[PDB]
Amino acid sequence: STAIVTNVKHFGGMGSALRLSEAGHTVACHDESFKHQDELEAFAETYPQLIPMSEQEPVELIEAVTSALGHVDILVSNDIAPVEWRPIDKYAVEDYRDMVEALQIKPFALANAVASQMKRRKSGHIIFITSAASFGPWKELSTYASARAGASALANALSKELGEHNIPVFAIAPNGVDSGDSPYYYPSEPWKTSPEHVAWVRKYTALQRLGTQKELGELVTFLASGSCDYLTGQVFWLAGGFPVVERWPG
Amino acid sequence: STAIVTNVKHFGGMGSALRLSEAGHTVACHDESFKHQDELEAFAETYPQLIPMSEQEPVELIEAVTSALGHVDILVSNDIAPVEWRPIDKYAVEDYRDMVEALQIKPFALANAVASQMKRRKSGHIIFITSAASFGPWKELSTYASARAGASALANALSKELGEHNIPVFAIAPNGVDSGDSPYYYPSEPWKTSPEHVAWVRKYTALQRLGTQKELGELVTFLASGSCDYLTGQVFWLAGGFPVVERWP
Amino acid sequence: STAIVTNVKHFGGMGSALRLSEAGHTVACHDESFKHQDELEAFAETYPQLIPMSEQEPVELIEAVTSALGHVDILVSNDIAPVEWRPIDKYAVEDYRDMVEALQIKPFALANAVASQMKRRKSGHIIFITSAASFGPWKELSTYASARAGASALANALSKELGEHNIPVFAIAPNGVDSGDSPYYYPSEPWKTSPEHVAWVRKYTALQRLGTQKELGELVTFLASGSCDYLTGQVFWLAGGFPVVERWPG
Amino acid sequence: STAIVTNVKHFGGMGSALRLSEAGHTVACHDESFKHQDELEAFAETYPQLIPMSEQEPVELIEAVTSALGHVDILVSNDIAPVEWRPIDKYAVEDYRDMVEALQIKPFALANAVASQMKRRKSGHIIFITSAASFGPWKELSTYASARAGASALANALSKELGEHNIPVFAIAPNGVDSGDSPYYYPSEPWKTSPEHVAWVRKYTALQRLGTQKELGELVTFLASGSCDYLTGQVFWLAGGFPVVERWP
Ligand SMILES: CCOC(=O)C[C@H]1CO1
Ligand SMILES: CCOC(=O)C[C@H]1CO1
Ligand SMILES: CCOC(=O)C[C@H]1CO1
Ligand SMILES: CCOC(=O)C[C@H]1CO1
Ligand SMILES: [Cl-]
Ligand SMILES: [Cl-]
Ligand SMILES: [Cl-]
Ligand SMILES: [Cl-]
């Protein structure tokens, strides 16, 4: 069983790769930095069980993995872009293009590249990591929220056609997941350290804590196991009960 | 840990008990048939890893399990009631009351009975098994669809208050799960044999099969493992892609 | 064209009755207080254009209206119950029964009582006023939120069967609508007066204001006009953008 | 007040312009055909209460209307693109880019161009006409369904930030609205004549007819009247009950 996890150093990246690996999958990993064989090797050394790739774009990643490791059973399209809090009139239209390109076109591209071998083998699983920002409660986050909703709708739409061919498709829409060293999107500093921040997580999520990489990885692994294919189409809000807003005063 | 699965013979019951058990939970099982000794012992003999309980009403069941076993960590409120397709004006009000009694009042009563215990220890898991009928595509299913939505909304709402106390709350909202010889809600006959049933499922569900007990058990067990408490509040659409509608002709 | 509006003194009651009336409907009104012909008459005197009823329960209301005024074209099931912020283990099961009875069984009962004449005339409109508390962000509001979600699901389910017979069914799920004198659910005091309260509406809704009776009445009247029957099934969140939660700190 | 309705000849266009106008708004109308003088004047002559504009691209259109008419109060982004049913692997990436360009980038561009003006005066209305396809029951509609969801999510999101400035934002998400001789998306032939089309609509929609231009115009006009700004953020499912699925056989 062969898996690919994209952007392996951020967001849901590590939780996913590490848990799948433990589950017995051969896990190919992609990251922008794996461009420099510098960075690639310091990661092969640190994680002998994962197997990182240099390839960057969807089709060369899929061919590279198919060639080296057999055939992709599992795609985890762990998608990232920076989050800027501009209001609408202050963005460039091109900014939305780049945002959509990053969060919406990318997973289309990955799924479009993997789909026909999965369909031929009548087997595979496809998971997008999106965001609870879709139809969420934030302001001045317009580009990000819509692009992410794009990607979750893609996942649901795709399930509908691939179910014929035994291929479940899922979206995982997180908020407040511990990214650790990565800035995408809840790095320890300042999210564990800054008092103001620990107060914010405390006020607005219901479990009054950040989620964990391990939690995110366990779900990915559960979905990837073939244990619950009937859930196909589901958007999972991976968010600890966010949002919670206080009772009336007085 | 200790789980209670209600109406174990039906709907999501067997998948939940079998699979919980398989996962080393201690599983007490409620059923309307366990009110008779003979029905109970037969079950205990067929499924010696489960412990079937005789108690029927909510408060009585929870104390009984707390006695025999010390604490209830995992409540699976596996709620059932007969679906009949009638138009709104052919019902009587009390038919709706009854449906709300079985589908909505009942999970509230179990949750209510177990909560303090759970909150005291700042640990536990609560799972309601509702139905994909909630905001669903059916007609003349008005009492059932709405009662199920109330139960699902109740899960979501409880998850908000009970986060404070480290208590995950979920709803599993199924359609087309294989129910063995149970008429709730997709018994293998006619659903596995009769051609017009076989084709209806091929037509309206994405994966083009029924769901299995094992898939739903696997879900419950997962939610109750503590491996992913952070999904708290989730309403799970266990419906194999349902519904799909054909393109334009 | 004949309309009935329930609990006419609270929640969406007045906005609805007054606007329908202006729209040219004969508006029968129900309120618990119309029990005492004391209260009934001081309301017929104050609103000569509305026509209040003494009848309390669904079937005697519908028969009474059908008999006096012709035939019910429009039902507005403006439903109310008190809101208590207990946690779950502190409620009596009977409390949920009373809550469900009030917010869920009542509109079932009203629609069940009106449905077959509307179906015979192949004409009518049915609107439940529910709440944005359904699947909403509050805590310790469990009974209320679920009962209200019950009632919105009813509305959506009912649309599906009555569309055959030319009958649109809608739910209107409000938050922060000015109730005025009524305590159900945003009376002027303290919602306009209390500083702490004006701050809360300001922080959590996006229009940073309470909604108005006039707004609520205009929507009801729009839905009741026969201008947009194709919307049938819709739950309208009548809530001014609630909830909004602040950006991260720092 | 002054409204702009884009792609006026198609989809939600005519209902929106006609009905806005009927409501005393001043209505500037965009279309891809108005790039030709002859196509434009013909329209102006058929519909002398509308003012058709020649400008095509987002920034150019908004300044042109602001010139001729002084301010834009109401933006109706009536967005269109051809639906073709292909499986995911039969598309090329750039087909998805193009669909996102027309359905998602485009309303963003119009909203972006008009916003400051609107925010300055702390008044205005923004309406996106998307589609009920978003979380919909279709297959092989993957690019269209997802592009439309992004646009709907964009409406919701904008409504949050633009409340601050008294700006209501909505999405109208239709299915089965009569489009006259427009192929976007339910032209009267074959949808009013051909039996298999007539029956598909009778089968899957609750009200068992098409929606009318007038119903959608009525909606837009209402949203833009300021009579109910408090619905801001709403995604409107203008789909006549769709979808309904048959009971068990
Ligand atoms: C920026 C607000 O936070 C989120 O949207 C969650 C994160 C996963 O995308
Ligand atoms: C056709 C109606 O049946 C269902 O909703 C499935 C079962 C869970 O309720
Ligand atoms: C008590 C919290 O406020 C609401 O749920 C809105 C009101 C209409 O029911
Ligand atoms: C069958 C797909 O067509 C639609 O979604 C209706 C139109 C608005 O997009
Ligand atoms: Cl996150
Ligand atoms: Cl089922
Ligand atoms: Cl309210
Ligand atoms: Cl349409």
CB B160 within 8 A of CB C138: yes
Nearest chain B CA: its distance from A214 CA (Å)? 8
A100 touching D (Cβ < 8 Å) = yes
Close Cβ partners of C24 (under 8 Å, ≥ 6 residues apart): C1
Of B25, B37, B32, the C-alpha closest to B10 is: B32
Partner-chain residue, chosen from A142, A149, A160, that has the shortest CB–CB distance to D149: A149
Render D82-125 in DSSP notation, one character per residue.
------GGGS-HHHHHHHHIIIIIHHHHHHHHHHHHHHHTT--E
Amino acid residing at C9:
K
D140 touching B (Cβ < 8 Å) = yes
Other CB atoms closer than 10 Å to residue A152's CB: what's the count? 30
Distance CA C24, CA A74 (A): 62
D200 touching A (Cβ < 8 Å) = no
Distance CA D242, CA C160 (A): 8
∠ CA B123-B128-B132 to the nearest 5 degrees?
145
Count: domains in chain B:
1
B249 touching D (Cβ < 8 Å) = yes
| Residue C219 to residues D156, D182, D229, Cα–Cα distance (Å) | 19, 30, 10
Distance CA B135, CA C156 (A): 7
Distance CA C47, CA C64 (A): 19
Other CB atoms closer than 10 Å to residue C202's CB: what's the count? 11
Distance CA D215, CA D177 (A): 9
Q: Are strands C74-78 and A26-29 parallel, antiparallel or unpaired?
A: unpaired
Burial B186-209 (b: 16+ CB within 10 A, else e): beeeebeeeeebbebbeebbbbbb
Strand ranges inside A30-105, DSSP E:
51-52, 74-78
Distance CA B223, CA A219 (A): 10
Cα–ligand 4 centroid distance for C250 (angstroms): 43
Which ligand approaches the C-alpha of residue B240 most closely? 6
Query: Is residue B142 lining ligand 2, measured as CB closer than 6 Å?
Result: no
Helix-strand-coil percent breakdown of chain B, rounded to 5? 45, 15, 40
The alpha carbon of B46 is separated from its chain's Cα centroid by a whole number of angstroms, namely: 22
Rounding to the nearest 10 degrees, give the CA dihedral for residues B63, B68, B72, B74.
-120
Burial class (CB in 10 A: 0-12, 13-18, 19+), A195: exposed
User: Given CA atoms A19, A22, A25, A26 in this order, what sign does their dihedral have?
Assistant: positive
Domain that holds residue B42: 1-249
| Residue C80: CATH number of its domain | 3.40.50.720
The alpha carbon of B113 is separated from its chain's Cα centroid by a whole number of angstroms, namely: 17
Interface test with D, best of A72, A91, A108, A169 (most D CBs within 10 A): A108
- Hey, what are C86's tokens? 């207990």
**DSSP alpha helix (H) spans, B53-92:** 58-69
Element (H, E) at A2: strand A2-5
Can you give the length of chain D in residues? 249
Which structural technique was applied?
A: X-ray
Of B136, B159, B156, B160, the C-alpha closest to B146 is: B136
Nearest chain A CA: its distance from B32 CA (Å)? 29
Residues in chain A closer than 8 A to D108 (CB atoms) = 93, 96, 142-143, 146
Ligand 4 atom closest to the CA of D141, numbered from 1: 2
B228 touching D (Cβ < 8 Å) = no
Distance CA B174, CA B211 (A): 9
Distance CA A26, CA A187 (A): 27
Interface test with B, best of A18, A230, A234, A238 (most B CBs within 10 A): A230
Close Cβ partners of C192 (under 8 Å, ≥ 6 residues apart): C178, C198, C210
List all chains that touch chain B, counting a touch as 3 or more CB pairs closer than 8 Å: A, C, D
Burial B117-141 (b: 16+ CB within 10 A, else e): bbbeeebbbbbbbbbbbbbbbbbbb
Looking at chain C, which residue has its C-alpha nearest residue B151?
A: C146
Q: What is the largest CA-CA distance in chain D?
A: 62
Distance CA A160, CA D3 (A): 38
Of A213, A216, A154, the C-alpha closest to A179 is: A213
Amino acid residing at C158:
L
Burial class (CB in 10 A: 0-12, 13-18, 19+), C40: middle
CB B172 within 8 A of CB B127: yes
- φ, ψ dihedrals at B207, nearest 5°: -80, -15
| Chain-chain contact of B163 with A222 (C-beta, under 8 angstroms) | no
- φ, ψ dihedrals at A87, nearest 5°: -80, 165
Distance CA A74, CA A114 (A): 9
Close Cβ partners of B96 (under 8 Å, ≥ 6 residues apart): B143, B147, C105, C108, C109, C112
Burial class (CB in 10 A: 0-12, 13-18, 19+), B24: exposed
Element (H, E) at C172: strand C169-174
Distance CA A237, CA A216 (A): 11
Radius of gyration of chain D (CA): 18
Nearest chain B CA: its distance from D157 CA (Å)? 22
| Residue A173 to residues A149, D18, D85, D150, Cα–Cα distance (Å) | 9, 41, 27, 15
CB D137 within 8 A of CB D82: no
Render A110-174 in DSSP notation, one character per residue.
HHHHHHHHHHHTT--EEEEE--TTTT-S-SS-HHHHHHHHHHHHHHHHHHHHHTTTT--EEEEEE
Residues with CB under 5 A from ligand 8 (ion): D 174-175, 177, 185
Cα–ligand 2 centroid distance for D209 (angstroms): 27
Can you give the length of chain A in residues? 250
Distance CA C88, CA B116 (A): 9
Of C22, C4, C10, C112, the C-alpha closest to C64 is: C4
Declared resolution, Å: 2.5
CB D169 within 8 A of CB D155: yes
B161 touching C (Cβ < 8 Å) = yes
Q: How many helices (H) and strands (E) does chain C have?
A: 9, 7
> Which residues, listed in sequence order, are joined to residue A4 by a DSSP beta bridge?
A28, A75
Element (H, E) at A92: none
CB C58 within 8 A of CB C110: yes
D179-188 contacts at long range (C-beta below 8 A, 24 or more positions apart): D179/D10, D179/D11, D179/D213, D180/D14, D180/D213, D182/D9, D182/D10, D182/D11, D182/D13, D183/D10, D183/D82, D184/D10, D184/D11, D184/D80, D184/D82, D185/D11, D185/D83, D185/D131, D186/D210
Other CB atoms closer than 10 Å to residue B67's CB: what's the count? 8
Strand ranges inside B33-150, DSSP E:
51-52, 74-78, 125-129
Distance CA A124, CA A94 (A): 35
Mapped onto helix, strand or coil, the DSSP state of residue B229 is helix
- φ, ψ dihedrals at A62, nearest 5°: -60, -40
* Residues with a CB atom less than 6 Å from ligand 3: C 83, 131-133, 138, 141, 174-175, 185
| Residue D162 to residues A74, D109, D220, Cα–Cα distance (Å) | 41, 16, 19
